[PDB]
């Protein structure tokens, strides 16, 4: 139910992972080490986060797994964008890892991804995305992935959940008291940005997979696993 759902999401927010720039100037290797070390740690916390969304731990194991494998990059990126929303031309990876757009030149293939992330962030900035809208959108990202039938009521349980999240978002948007038509436009504007987030995610995944192959960066543990597919 919308108010309670929204408070649960609020209380579910994962902590800020702290990381710092290395002492030496960035290289491709050292930049990738920093961002993957950050991602890996944030992944740990994303599991605990997901488990706090009502219903999530009532879905089947394969379902929880499949949603998390499918959305984790998207969720990393969404959280990044929210962190960076007030800081044009910058990506706020962590309080002490604030990358200027140009610093992406450091890593082959990454500037384009920074620009996508930056563009999607500006679009949220233009729309004046509100904290509670961000909470709902991020949970929708967890819940809204293709789930063609696997061969292993969880699917209806999924729909009910994503339904309640979508209602919560509609309810948050109602608080603005704007025109009915403009409440529809805003919903559409926020959900249409979900594709952009999926799209960046796709480029991010591919970029990192390739970095891993070229042994340009070692990846460990959770991140390594989520990567191995």
């Amino acid at each position: 139910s919308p108010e309670q759902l929204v408070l649960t999401l609020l209380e579910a927010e994962p902590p800020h992972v702290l990381i710092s720039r290395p002492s030496a100037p960035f290289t491709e290797a050292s930049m990738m080490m920093s961002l993957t070390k950050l991602a890996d740690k944030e992944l740990v916390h994303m599991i605990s986060w997901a488990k706090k969304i009502p219903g999530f731990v009532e879905l089947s194991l394969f379902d929880q797994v499949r949603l998390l494998e499918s959305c984790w990059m998207e969720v990393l990126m969404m959280g990044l964008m929210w962190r960076s929303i007030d800081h044009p031309g910058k990506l706020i990876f962590a309080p002490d890892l604030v990358l200027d757009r140009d610093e992406g030149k450091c890593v082959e293939g990454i500037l384009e991804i920074f620009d996508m992330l930056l563009a999607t962030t500006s679009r949220f900035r233009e729309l004046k995305l509100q904290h509670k809208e961000y909470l709902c959108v991020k949970a929708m990202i967890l819940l809204n992935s293709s789930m063609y039938p696997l061969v292993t009521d969880s699917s209806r349980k999924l729909a009910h959940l994503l339904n309640a999240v979508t209602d919560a978002l509609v309810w948050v948007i109602a608080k603005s008291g704007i025109s009915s038509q403009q409440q529809s436009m805003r919903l559409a504007n926020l959900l249409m940005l979900l594709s952009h987030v999926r799209h960046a995610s796709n480029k991010g995944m591919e970029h990192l997979l390739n970095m891993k192959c070229k042994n340009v960066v070692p990846v460990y543990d959770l991140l390594l696993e989520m990567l191995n597919a």
């Binding site: 740990v44 194991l61 929880q64 797994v65 998390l68 494998e69 543990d221 696993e225 191995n228």
Partner: peptide, 10 residues
């Protein structure tokens, strides 16, 4: 395959 994920979910 989800050696660690399963671990953390359960």
């Amino acid at each position: 395959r989800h050696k660690i994920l399963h671990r953390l979910l359960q």
